[PDB]
């Protein structure tokens, strides 16, 4: 593993929404908890060996915090990631989970360019227990930015991004719960698909320590924390040759 690329940088974007419900309406209180989870999923990532052996240490660092105290004003009819109104339903607490991801993506594009990756913190109850979304891992996206053109848009978005919310069922999640949301969002974001059923080393039964972070399923499990050898496998196969491309030093 290089040392002088081994880091994913982030930008890391707290909404209006975050900034008032988990920040209390302050700066540093909003700082201090992304700066703590992301160092505790970095513990993650960076304790975990890709191929079972030396292949460790590499992780996620923050670039940059960008702090959105108020909603961004929109025209009528202009759409915002951080616009005060739901969308596509005003009515709901939430965004749609993906025209959300679409929106950020879209609105980030010229800071996503310069960075590994870009991720939103947001704090709404998106339906049916959705707690957040990704680029990469899907049955194109992830690390390092790659282009796609916005024909609605008319200018190139980039899928190095994906977002949590920390509302879900009208509550705030517990901070246990969220480190597992960025975990597998970013592990998407590193290649890793959602472990299948059909794959017992990859899904184990509760008492064989329950299943990996990549599960379908939103930790008091051994293995809630933990990557499975499928994740592994796959994070693995891109991870190097991503590094190569857009990783860093450690800071
Ligand atoms: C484990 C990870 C965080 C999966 C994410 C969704 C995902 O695949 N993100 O990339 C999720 O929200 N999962 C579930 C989840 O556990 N949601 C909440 C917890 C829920 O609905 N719980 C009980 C529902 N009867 C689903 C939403 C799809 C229901
Ligand atoms: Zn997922």
């Given at each position: 593993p290089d040392p002088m690329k081994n880091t994913c940088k982030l930008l890391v974007v707290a909404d209006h929404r975050f900034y008032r419900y988990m920040g209390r309406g302050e700066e540093s209180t909003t700082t201090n908890y992304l700066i703590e989870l992301i160092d505790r999923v970095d513990d993650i990532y960076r304790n975990t060996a890709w191929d079972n052996?030396?292949?460790?240490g590499y992780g996620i660092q923050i670039e940059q915090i960008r702090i959105l105290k108020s909603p961004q004003e929109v025209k009528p009819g202009e759409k915002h990631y951080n616009m005060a109104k739901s969308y596509?339903?005003?009515?709901?607490?939430?965004?749609?989970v993906k025209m959300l991801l679409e929106q950020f993506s879209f609105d980030i594009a010229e800071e996503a360019s310069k960075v590994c990756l870009a991720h939103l913190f947001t704090y709404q109850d998106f339906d049916m227990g959705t707690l957040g979304l990704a680029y990469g891992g899907s049955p194109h996206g992830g690390v390092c930015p790659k282009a796609y053109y916005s024909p609605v848009g008319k200018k190139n978005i980039y899928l190095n991004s994906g977002l949590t919310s920390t509302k879900n069922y009208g509550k705030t999640i517990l901070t246990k719960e969220a480190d597992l949301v960025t975990t597998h969002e970013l592990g998407h974001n590193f290649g890793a698909e959602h472990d299948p059923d059909g794959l017992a080393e990859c899904a184990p039964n509760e008492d064989q320590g329950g299943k990996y972070v990549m599960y379908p399923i939103a930790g008091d499990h051994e293995n809630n924390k933990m990557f499975s050898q499928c994740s592994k496998q796959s994070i693995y196969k891109t991870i190097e040759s991503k590094a190569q491309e857009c990783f860093q030093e450690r800071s």
């Amino acid at each position: 593993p290089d040392p002088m690329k081994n880091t994913c940088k982030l930008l890391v974007v707290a909404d209006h929404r975050f900034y008032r419900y988990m920040g209390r309406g302050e700066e540093s209180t909003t700082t201090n908890y992304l700066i703590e989870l992301i160092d505790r999923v970095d513990d993650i990532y960076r304790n975990t060996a890709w191929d079972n052996a030396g292949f460790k240490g590499y992780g996620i660092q923050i670039e940059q915090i960008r702090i959105l105290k108020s909603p961004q004003e929109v025209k009528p009819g202009e759409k915002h990631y951080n616009m005060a109104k739901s969308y596509p339903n005003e009515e709901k607490d939430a965004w749609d989970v993906k025209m959300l991801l679409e929106q950020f993506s879209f609105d980030i594009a010229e800071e996503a360019s310069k960075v590994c990756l870009a991720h939103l913190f947001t704090y709404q109850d998106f339906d049916m227990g959705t707690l957040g979304l990704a680029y990469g891992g899907s049955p194109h996206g992830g690390v390092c930015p790659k282009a796609y053109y916005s024909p609605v848009g008319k200018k190139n978005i980039y899928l190095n991004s994906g977002l949590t919310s920390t509302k879900n069922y009208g509550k705030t999640i517990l901070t246990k719960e969220a480190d597992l949301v960025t975990t597998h969002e970013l592990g998407h974001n590193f290649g890793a698909e959602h472990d299948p059923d059909g794959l017992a080393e990859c899904a184990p039964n509760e008492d064989q320590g329950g299943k990996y972070v990549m599960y379908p399923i939103a930790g008091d499990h051994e293995n809630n924390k933990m990557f499975s050898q499928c994740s592994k496998q796959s994070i693995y196969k891109t991870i190097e040759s991503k590094a190569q491309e857009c990783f860093q030093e450690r800071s």
